[PDB]
Amino acid sequence: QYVRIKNWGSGEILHDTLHHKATSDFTCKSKSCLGSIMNPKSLTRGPRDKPTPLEELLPHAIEFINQYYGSFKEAKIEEHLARLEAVTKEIETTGTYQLTLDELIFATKMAWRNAPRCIGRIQWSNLQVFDARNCSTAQEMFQHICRHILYATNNGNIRSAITVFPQRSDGKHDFRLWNSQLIRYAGYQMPDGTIRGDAATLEFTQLCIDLGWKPRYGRFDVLPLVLQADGQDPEVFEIPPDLVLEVTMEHPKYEWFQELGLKWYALPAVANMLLEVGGLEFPACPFNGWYMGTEIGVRDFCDTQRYNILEEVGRRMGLETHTLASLWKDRAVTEINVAVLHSFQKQNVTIMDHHTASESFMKHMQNEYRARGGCPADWIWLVPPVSGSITPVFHQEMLNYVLSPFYYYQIEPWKTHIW
Amino acid sequence: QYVRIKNWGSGEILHDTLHHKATSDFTCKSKSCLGSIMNPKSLTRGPRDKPTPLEELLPHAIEFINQYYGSFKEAKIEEHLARLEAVTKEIETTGTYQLTLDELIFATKMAWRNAPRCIGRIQWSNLQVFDARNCSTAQEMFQHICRHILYATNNGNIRSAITVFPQRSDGKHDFRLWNSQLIRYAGYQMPDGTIRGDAATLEFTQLCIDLGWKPRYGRFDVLPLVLQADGQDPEVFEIPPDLVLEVTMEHPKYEWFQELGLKWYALPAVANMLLEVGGLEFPACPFNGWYMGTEIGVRDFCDTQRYNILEEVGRRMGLETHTLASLWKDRAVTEINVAVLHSFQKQNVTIMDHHTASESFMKHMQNEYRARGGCPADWIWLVPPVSGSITPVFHQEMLNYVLSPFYYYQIEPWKTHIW
Ligand code: HEM
Ligand code: HEM
Ligand SMILES: C[C@H](O)[C@H](O)[C@H]1CNc2nc(N)[nH]c(=O)c2N1
Ligand SMILES: C[C@H](O)[C@H](O)[C@H]1CNc2nc(N)[nH]c(=O)c2N1
Ligand SMILES: CC(=N)NCc1cccc(CN)c1
Numbered sequence: 013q014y015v016r017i018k019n020w021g022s023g024e025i026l027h028d029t030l031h032h033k034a035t036s037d038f039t040c041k042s043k044s045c046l047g048s049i050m051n052p053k054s055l056t057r058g059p060r061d062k063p064t065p066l067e068e069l070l071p072h073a074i075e076f077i078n079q080y081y082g083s084f085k086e087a088k089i090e091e092h093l094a095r096l097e098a099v100t101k102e103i104e105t106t107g108t109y110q111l112t113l114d115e116l117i118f119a120t121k122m123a124w125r126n127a128p129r130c131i132g133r134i135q136w137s138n139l140q141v142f143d144a145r146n147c148s149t150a151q152e153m154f155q156h157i158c159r160h161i162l163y164a165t166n167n168g169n170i171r172s173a174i175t176v177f178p179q180r181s182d183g184k185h186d187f188r189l190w191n192s193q194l195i196r197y198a199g200y201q202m203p204d205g206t207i208r209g210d211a212a213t214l215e216f217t218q219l220c221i222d223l224g225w226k227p228r229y230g231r232f233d234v235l236p237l238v239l240q241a242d243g244q245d246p247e248v249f250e251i252p253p254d255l256v257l258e259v260t261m262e263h264p265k266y267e268w269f270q271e272l273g274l275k276w277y278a279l280p281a282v283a284n285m286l287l288e289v290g291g292l293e294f295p296a297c298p299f300n301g302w303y304m305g306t307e308i309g310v311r312d313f314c315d316t317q318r319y320n321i322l323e324e325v326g327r328r329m330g331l332e333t334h335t336l337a338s339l340w341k342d343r344a345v346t347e348i349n350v351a352v353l354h355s356f357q358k359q360n361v362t363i364m365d366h367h368t369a370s371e372s373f374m375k376h377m378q379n380e381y382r383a384r385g386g387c388p389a390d391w392i393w394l395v396p397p398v399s400g401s402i403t404p405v406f407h408q409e410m411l412n413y414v415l416s417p418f419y420y421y422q423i424e425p426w427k428t429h430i431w
Numbered sequence: 432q433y434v435r436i437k438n439w440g441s442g443e444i445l446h447d448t449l450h451h452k453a454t455s456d457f458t459c460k461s462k463s464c465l466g467s468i469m470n471p472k473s474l475t476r477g478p479r480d481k482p483t484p485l486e487e488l489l490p491h492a493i494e495f496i497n498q499y500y501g502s503f504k505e506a507k508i509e510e511h512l513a514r515l516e517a518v519t520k521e522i523e524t525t526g527t528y529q530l531t532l533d534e535l536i537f538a539t540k541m542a543w544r545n546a547p548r549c550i551g552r553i554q555w556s557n558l559q560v561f562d563a564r565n566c567s568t569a570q571e572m573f574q575h576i577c578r579h580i581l582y583a584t585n586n587g588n589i590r591s592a593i594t595v596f597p598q599r600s601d602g603k604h605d606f607r608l609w610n611s612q613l614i615r616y617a618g619y620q621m622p623d624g625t626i627r628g629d630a631a632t633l634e635f636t637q638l639c640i641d642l643g644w645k646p647r648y649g650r651f652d653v654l655p656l657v658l659q660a661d662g663q664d665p666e667v668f669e670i671p672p673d674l675v676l677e678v679t680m681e682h683p684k685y686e687w688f689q690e691l692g693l694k695w696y697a698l699p700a701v702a703n704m705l706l707e708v709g710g711l712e713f714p715a716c717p718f719n720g721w722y723m724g725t726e727i728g729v730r731d732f733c734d735t736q737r738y739n740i741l742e743e744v745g746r747r748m749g750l751e752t753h754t755l756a757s758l759w760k761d762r763a764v765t766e767i768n769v770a771v772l773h774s775f776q777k778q779n780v781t782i783m784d785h786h787t788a789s790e791s792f793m794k795h796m797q798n799e800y801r802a803r804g805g806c807p808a809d810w811i812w813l814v815p816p817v818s819g820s821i822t823p824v825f826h827q828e829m830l831n832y833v834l835s836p837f838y839y840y841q842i843e844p845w846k847t848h849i850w
């Protein structure tokens with residue numbers, strides 16, 4: 013039966029029944045709890061060597077088709093049963109099946125809808141889908157991605173979108189983007205042991221250099237796209253600079269902020285996740301939404317392991333940078349968050365502060381419970397990296413479970429790749 | 432075997448083997464994750480009607496005795512085996528057993544050490560234990576508690592301490608403190624629907640009033656102690672005002688802060704938890720440590736469901752209180768945190784900011800892994816209510832499991848009490 017869930021802020025109670033559809037086992041054991049693990053196996057969908065067994069696929073495929081046709085207001089039994097039949101025949105005769113464009117569209121929005129770590133799921137229905145299932149080469153990939161970047165960026169007025177490339181067949185011809193994000197900065201380890209740029213991309217930057225890319229050695233050097241089509245080796249493509257919109261950071265009071273020389277790309281596009289639907293797997297389906305301040309202000313700029321700009325901004329504010337209990341870190345990070353939001357608005361690039369994001373997610377969560385009695389939600393990821401208890405999601409209890417469709421992680425392609 | 436755990440901040444890896452000793456099942460299922468549940472059953476140890484079965488007790492008792500004697504540098508096999516024998520005989524002849532003072536001391540520090548939601552466990556070894564196992568009446572309880580409060584408060588220089596009252600026998604004569612905390616403010620619902628004081632204590636305040644306590648109707652009215660000795664009904668005792676040390680809040684710049692009329696008790700003492708050790712249960716064992724800024728500054732003052740002073744301090748700062756994206760909440764809460772720390776230091780009352788607390792916990796966690804290969808830790812509770820990613824614990828992966836000794840929650844005494 014349902015699991016009782018409470019919001020200590022409003023005292024409200026919800027009954028989650030949706031979790032009953034969860035699939036395999038999650039992270040945390042039966043007696044241990046592995047909830048703060050970023051990459052648990054229950055969240056990763058690795059490579060394959062052979063096709064998915066008919067016995068497994070068919071059952072899932074039927075399930076999905078039933079889910080799709082079930083989503084309609086006033087059904088279409090005939091079309092429904094018809095579809096189930098066609099899919100069965102297709103698997104018997106081909107060994108797999110093709111989703112109708114409409115079902116793919118439905119599949120991508122549902123998987124988004126079922127992303128427990130996404131705070132912007134209130135937009136799950138507003139998503140542009142580019143069907144690249146016909147793609148054959150890396151060159152065509154690069155072309156599609158470019159269309160995507162251009163469509164999504166929309167001159168600052170960001171639009172959510174996803175590009176679906178060929179589904180995995182035998183797992184021996186997988187289409188993959190070796191990049192973590194469509195657009196990202198490179199990390200160079202200078203001779204003197206000093207890291208320059210985005211430390212998070214040190215290994216990947218090396219990979220690109222290894223694949224022949226010319227390293228410019230700058231704090232903000234956009235990395236090349238490394239595409240892998242039909243199981244083939246990867247090819248490196250520079251991304252047209254005109255296509256990459258960036259926001260230069262500047263604070264509305266501390267005019268010395270510009271003197272830090274900060275900027276960040278406007279498009280947050282995930283490139284390496286796998287889309288699973290009806291037994292089908294899409295190892296290459298780059299998607300994007302718009303930024304939430306804290307991602308850049310808090311994590312990207314202040315993470316000790318990223319650009320780590322917190323002490324500098326601290327000193328530039330003349331704070332007791334050496335008296336930890338002075339709470340200078342609290343003062344600094346907040347101003348850096350104001351610079352990010354302010355600088356994005358100034359330049360007309362869509363962005364949303366964390367307080368507002370949190371509010372909408374609660375609204376969404378309520379709709380999800382009224383709509384289907386549940387909302388897979390990972391509290392650890394949904395609560396903003398700053399102002400935790402000051403946002404309402406912090407006070408909301410939640411259940412995290414893997415449904416289907418879903419967006420899984422994958423093993424880094426350079427590890428599992430036969431050159 | 433061990434579970435690999437990583438700290439994304441340092442990239443460091445740890446191997447947790449300690450979880451192997453975990454007992455029953457935790458919160459999160461096999462496929463679902465109930466990690467953000469405050470009161471899961473796996474964390475509560477309710478009432479009993481009969482004694483604990485010999486078959487269960489003996490096994491646990493032996494386990495504990497083995498753990499105790501095992502903790503020594505260069506053992507005492509003779510004393511050890513001797514002790515195991517005496518305890519066995521004692522259970523056979525009495526139906527339970529008594530812990531030596533030393534074992535109780537060891538038991539209380541271990542249970543603290545095994546508290547997954549405690550960020551100050553680096554102090555687990557520094558804890559004063561007051562043995563009240565001989566207590567017979569409520570009056571004697573009240574006396575002990577008073578000694579505790581006086582000892583712990585130590586004129587501002589707070590000292591960690593715990594008072595252990597009689598262990599549960601048949602569960603029909605349980606010693607219980609009906610209070611959530613030794614010292615806490617009352618919550619009154621004014622006629623016009625307006626809450627006054629601490630909203631979190633509305634129900635309990637009513638209970639005290641029902642039991643005859645005279646309601647003064649103020650924002651900061653210290654609640655009476657409601658003691659229950661040997662299964663008897665509860666009796667209400669006013670706490671000697673001289674014994675309750677309080678800090679009046681004031682900001683080191685915004686002199687208008689004093690005009691808010693804020694203060695808070697200096698002693699954070701948990702009163703309603705149950706201590707479990709060697710099959711034994713102690714339903715009444717009030718303990719205390721010292722405050723961590725955010726508890727008061729962030730949660731108590733800013734929780735919408737507590738004193739909710741965030742918009743007031745916002746306006747008093749002349750912030751865009753109506754433009755959520757202005758991040759005024761971020762500015763306000765921080766100043767309220769500075770007032771708390773500043774006001775505590777000013778008056779010489781021990782307190783620790785969250786950044787410093789977080790740092791020490793990491794140090795402790797490292798010691799715990801080197802010492803015993805593990806540290807039961809609940810990430811959701813250990814990460815401060817503000818400046819999440821700015822503190823190192825946010826970036827540390829951790830496993831949460833219930834070991835023994837342990838401090839369990841209990842069912843509210845007024846629900847399970849035969850008057
Ligand atoms: C339109 C507004 C959107 C906003 C503001 C938003 C915001 C967020 C944030 C803050 C995160 C956390 C990222 C991190 O901390 O590294 C996240 C994660 C995620 N979002 Fe969204 N999102 C949006 C759109 C999308 C879209 C369109 C999709 C997919 C179709 C999506 C799928 C996900 C997934 C799967 C994650 C998990 C990423 C991971 O596990 O690494 N999001 N989102
Ligand atoms: C000496 C310094 C100490 C500090 C700074 C400290 C700090 C904390 C904090 C911040 C919490 C979270 C409370 C909340 O958010 O409601 C907590 C919880 C807890 N602490 Fe500590 N603590 C200390 C000492 C103690 C002592 C001495 C014990 C026991 C002997 C203890 C046992 C626990 C337990 C069991 C919890 C869980 C409370 C619950 O689940 O409601 N702590 N502590
Ligand atoms: C160890 C811990 O799981 C890890 O640091 C998590 C915490 N919460 C997070 N939340 C979001 N949105 N993004 C992250 O990368 C993380 N990191
Ligand atoms: C719903 C959620 O579990 C709840 O709000 C938790 C989150 N983390 C917490 N952390 C601490 N220290 N104290 C709390 O009361 C909470 N509340
Ligand atoms: C769409 C959005 N706002 N953010 C999702 C996201 C962007 C960049 C990196 C990561 C890390 N997985 C997630």
Ligand SMILES: CC(=N)NCc1cccc(CN)c1
Nearest residue numbers: 612699700719720721722723
């Ligand atoms: C000892 C310490 N610093 N804090 C523990 C604590 C104090 C008051 C209330 C609660 C809520 N369970 C916990």
Ligand SMILES: [Zn+2]
Nearest residue numbers: 040045459466
């Ligand atoms: Zn869990």
